[PDB]
Design an enzyme around this catalytic site. Structure first.
Site, short mmCIF file in Angstrom:
data_model
loop_
_atom_site.label_atom_id
_atom_site.label_comp_id
_atom_site.label_asym_id
_atom_site.label_seq_id
_atom_site.Cartn_x
_atom_site.Cartn_y
_atom_site.Cartn_z
N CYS A 1 45.21 39.30 42.31
CA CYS A 1 45.55 38.18 41.44
C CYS A 1 45.51 38.60 39.93
O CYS A 1 46.45 38.34 39.18
CB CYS A 1 44.60 37.02 41.69
N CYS B 1 39.58 37.49 42.47
CA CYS B 1 40.60 38.20 43.23
C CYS B 1 41.28 39.24 42.35
O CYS B 1 42.08 38.92 41.47
CB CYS B 1 41.58 37.20 43.91
#
Length: 108
Positions: free
Chosen positions: A35, A32
């Protein structure tokens, strides 16, 4: 990090549900991008909010059990806990500035 707690499914209760104070949990994954973008920022926050909160991260691939319990649909998701109970929900990458404001507003 040094100040960041690295959580697991098994240590979640003790580290989060039983802590006497506020904990900012980041649910994230290696694939991600956003993230990864917020990781350095979570590091600064953990320095600057020392004594006011603890930052913790749960990687949801390595620890798949905990996210369903909090209805987590997408990542990153940041959940502010105060003595075991979610005070505030935040979802998506935000900048350092946006995160400070989120924290100052919900920690009061």
């Amino acid at each position: 990090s040094d100040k960041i707690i690295h959580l697991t499914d098994d240590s979640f209760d003790t580290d989060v549900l039983k802590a006497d104070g506020a904990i900012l949990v980041d649910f994230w994954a290696e694939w991600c991008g956003p993230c990864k973008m917020i990781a350095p920022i979570l590091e600064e926050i953990a320095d600057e909010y020392q004594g006011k909160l603890t930052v913790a991260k749960l990687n949801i691939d390595q620890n798949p059990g905990t996210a369903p319990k909090y209805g987590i649909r997408g990542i990153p998701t940041l959940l502010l806990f105060k003595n075991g109970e979610v005070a505030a929900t935040k979802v998506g990458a935000l900048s350092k500035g946006q995160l400070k404001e989120f924290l100052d507003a919900n920690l009061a």
